[PDB]
Structure 1
């Protein structure tokens, strides 16, 4: 049976979805305040990202309507440049999870068509893929000012391409992404398992040396070391080794404690200089640590997971709206009148990002401590109070520190329905539901089977 908090998640989903249906059907993103839409892919991004969430939440009439759109209206031949990583985690991942949950081969046929159109990105001298590929013309290229790719982008596509090869029997997808993983396994320039942010597609070597973050441009590299190891049945020992090494590197170089509360946080390093800056993106890490412990990683990882979960919770609850900003800074020394969680004026936006509630899901699944459910519910209520648009939809907001004037940005990111609400529903579940023994979630919350 659905419980009270799950019913609340479903009310939020359906209010979001009614805005999408009325004002943005088949378009990439809802602009709820203006009752319009935006495109970047032109491939119904929000719809595809939400397929599996609709299925899991039991929204089967909505799923059927969306399936009909996929069957009739989703076509990949347009002259359009797409980012390989964003494409892969949202569209390829979303189609693959929709296939597995529904059993409907339409989703696999579409995934295979799309996957084939992404392949030109790998045709570089080093076989590290370009950032962008045109799905209609077959031309791939790097950004205008550089031949570098982003490290997280080239190392956070593996689950999806590996699974596509498994289902289709076409080895080209797996072979391409595994070359990337194996190459990066042997690269110089890491700091105790920590990777630089960029990698050159011509030389194959890291660039921006000596600069280390667990946030944007590197985060999901670490996530996918563990998750690939799990996906593959725990036989690919190099992935585990590199993951274990990296977590020790985080402990050695990036962990400090805040004032006044002594919260454990992860900062950044540049040429040996520590910076107390932490992207909300880093909040994936407690959940990934806990996931690893479920699968046999050391208890030290759980100690760190629980400390970081508290911190990520505080990043939300110390704000006036109860919603974390995009980026926080912490103080290493006591500052009269100051909270733990400092926020630069420019960083005060919230884009409805999932990483805190993602990690709460894993902490709850692994520990059973109901406080993590309570924290998730608190955060959901804050989304409802400060980001809801009366006519339908929820919006990113510009100011998490002004409860009277949060200032909507007029955008509902696809990951709100793809991730934030899926993880909350799962967090609250009393159930055999997407077992950690049977599935691994991709980095856009799309569950894929463990082999």
Structure 2
């Protein structure tokens, strides 16, 4: 049984969370990720990733009993004295961000203590000549190093909210100073295309690499997101961040924005040495949300028009599929041809890993416009998750074929961001309380962990 006050859609999200958590608790407790189909688990860093990523979601959904049990695990089983290499970015947005939000929501100092411990262990990654951090760092030995080879731009520019907040709470300025150094370096770095940034950067030279190739998908997405979010977090005082964000959006309009045929769906493609590619990762669906968030905070009304158009397109990326779930990547038709549909998907990209981007943006579009249809769209997507990704014994799994409702083909994996992001954004989307994690008081990191806006 669940709280009587909850509207039916939030109640529904809770039901889904509980079924998902049932699987985690039974077959992967304390492990990074659940393997629902095989009733097993998988380890990435060995730091209870799914548990930490879901802490704030449990608190927000009112699952206090579950939260307490998870809190106990953090207190007794989470140890950073381990010989393991972690990705600075992935561990920052999930672990550091997740512990920080858990700390703020619960008021439990345990989470802050663990966050400060982890933050210190990540610092060796910034020990480079350019000060642009290495991609990986061994939290136990203290040695940092690049991938098995430069660092990716999104990775070094999407850890700022977390490190800035850790400094604010601890009084230890080294975290903030380290990440702000990278932000400042990126700002004056050449190699950009009207605000658009390359996907990689060399830690030794500190220069952009893989020049002339731009995308807002994997390897770059959150860079644009954090320009705006840092500005918001800092109390809208850091004009350079705002300016870079505004320039970037214009760069998007000028180089990556196109429309499909015959429906004229607005979308963002990729550019490689002058050649446009009508390819759009689902990851890019974070944009309408970020755009709307900006509008709420005073950005151009043109950003809102773009946000609504892209939200519609992202919704269609889901609804045009037989399962109602968007695939990993979607290609759009640019030229006139009758009978030719707008959305196309390659056989290799028909997987759905329970990603949050569409529901994330629906949350922002609803909060800013108050248009109930965005809630309706989110409810439809949740129905699809329940119908095609549910694992009877517990949990939900990524699927290989979004186009076959009879045989979706589970991949036997529940990404940590399903409980950390996807279900949190849906719960919030269904709330009709603008004061629940208000856009005026909190800013979500890129893994859906809310952090307080500074005064």
Q: What is the match of residue 344 of structure 1?
A: 346
CA separation in 2, counterparts of 1:260 and 1:340? 6
Report the alpha carbon displacement of residue 337 of structure 1 after superposing the two structures with TM. Answer: 4.1
* Runs of 4+ off more than 4 Å: none
Report 1:381-400 matches (<5 A). 381-400=383-402
The answer to whether the 8 Å contact 2:285/2:361 transfers is yes
SS at the partner of 1:337? coil
In structure 2, the residue corresponding to 1:117 is in which secondary structure? helix
**Shift of residue 28, structure 1, vs aligned partner:** 0.3
The answer for the alignment partner of 2:270 in structure 1 is 268
Q: TM-score, normalised by structure 2?
A: 0.98
Quick check: 1:127 aligned with 2:135?
no
Distance in 2 between residues matched to 1:337 and 1:66, nearest whole Å: 53
Could you tell me whether the CA contact under 8 Å between 1:10 and 1:57 is conserved in 2?
A: yes
Quote the RMSD (CA, aligned, Å). Answer: 0.6
Instruction: Please state how far the C-alpha of 1:108 moved relative to its aligned partner.
Output: 0.1
Aligned length, in residue pairs:
449
For residues 199 and 21 of structure 1, what CA distance do their matches in structure 2 show? 40
| 1:166-224 residue CA offsets vs partner (Å, 9 max, x unmatched) | 00000010010000000000000101100000000000000000001010111100000
Indicate conservation of the 8 Å contact 2:261/2:342, yes or no: yes
Q: Does 1:86 align with 2:90?
A: yes
SS in structure 2 opposite 1:362?
Answer: helix
Post-superposition Cα deviations, 1:51-105, rounded to whole Å, max 9, x if no partner, equal: 0000000000000000000000000011100000000000000000000000000
CA shift for structure 1 position 340: 1.3
Q: Determine the C-alpha separation between the residues in 1 that align with 2:34 and 2:251.
A: 40
In the superposition, the TM-score normalised over structure 1's length comes to: 0.99
Q: Which residue of 1 aligns with 2:423?
A: 421
| 1:448 matched residue in structure 2 | 451
Q: Deviations over 1:373-430 (max 9, x none)?
A: 0000000000000000000000000000000000000000000000000000000002
Moved more, 413-422 or 329-338: 329-338
CA contact (8 A) 1:23 1:35 kept: yes
Tell me, what secondary structure is at the counterpart of 1:437?
coil
- 1:142 deviation in Å? 0.2
> 2-side partners of 1:171 and 1:189: how far apart?
30
Contact 2:262 2:338 (C-alpha < 8 Å) held by counterparts:
no
Structure 2 residues not aligned, in runs of 5+: none
Q: Say whether the 8 Å CA contact 1:291–1:362 is kept in structure 2.
A: yes
Displacement of 1:143: 1.2
8 A Cα contact 1:318 1:339, kept in partner: no
1:100 corresponds in structure 2 to 104
In structure 2, C-alpha distance between the alignment counterparts of 1:240 and 1:205, rounded to whole Å: 23
Gaps (5+ residues) in structure 1? Answer: none
Deviations, residues 327-351 of structure 1 (Å, cap 9, x unaligned): 0100101345432111000000000
Tell me, what secondary structure is at the counterpart of 1:256?
strand
What is the rounded CA distance, in whole Å, between the counterparts of 1:414 and 1:406 in structure 2? Answer: 20
Contact residue 333 and residue 342 of structure 2 kept, 8 A: yes
Structure 2 counterpart of 1:12, from 8, 12, 16: 16
Q: How far apart, in 2, do the equivalents of 1:152 and 1:335 lie?
A: 37
Q: Assess if the C-alpha contact under 8 Å between 1:358 and 1:424 holds in 2.
A: yes
CA contact (8 A) 1:121 1:140 kept: yes
Deviations 1:108-140 (A, max 9, x none): 000000000000100011000000000011010
Asked whether the 8 Å contact 2:194–2:250 carries over to 1, the reply is yes
